[PDB]
Design a protein around this nucleic acid. Structure first.
Length: 114
RNA sequence: ACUGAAACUGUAGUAGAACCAAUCGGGGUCGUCAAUA
């Protein structure tokens, strides 16, 4: 069926912090720096199997967007609004790098603009 | 067993009215490959 990338629950404090540091080889709070290509012989493994990113959108940053909907039934609308009103600690997965933990996002409705 | 002459195929008339270059699509992501000893 439909392939999904489960949210990386329980990533410790500072997991994404200072990401240039090759912490991939130590179990800091029980997790390896799984999103970063490990260094080999002390040099960066910028091979043509991996990409590199000059930056990323920080965690806890916030985006607002709008959905304009037409002729949704109550089931079709209720399915949509369920996704946009999931209980706490349900997170959507967005963009790239999802296998590595990137792109976990919380969606919630702004009711005053709906 | 005396050539008729003279006479604009012209005048009026918008190739135009209606018609969305548009519909769908996360710049994304894991284990394969080779066959013998």
């Amino acid at each position: 069926g439909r392939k999904v990338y489960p949210h990386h629950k329980g990533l410790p404090n500072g997991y994404w912090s200072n990401p240039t540091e090759d912490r991939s080889q130590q179990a800091i709070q029980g997790h390896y720096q799984e999103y970063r290509r490990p260094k080999k012989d002390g040099l960066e493994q910028r091979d043509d199997q991996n990409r590199s990113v000059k930056g990323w959108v920080k965690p806890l940053t916030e985006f607002t967007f709008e959905i304009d909907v037409t002729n949704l039934s109550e089931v079709e609308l209720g399915a949509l609004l369920w996704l946009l009103t999931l209980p706490d600690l349900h997170f959507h997965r967005l963009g790239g790098g999802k296998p590595l933990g990137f792109g976990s996002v919380r969606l919630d409705i702004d009711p005053d603009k709906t």
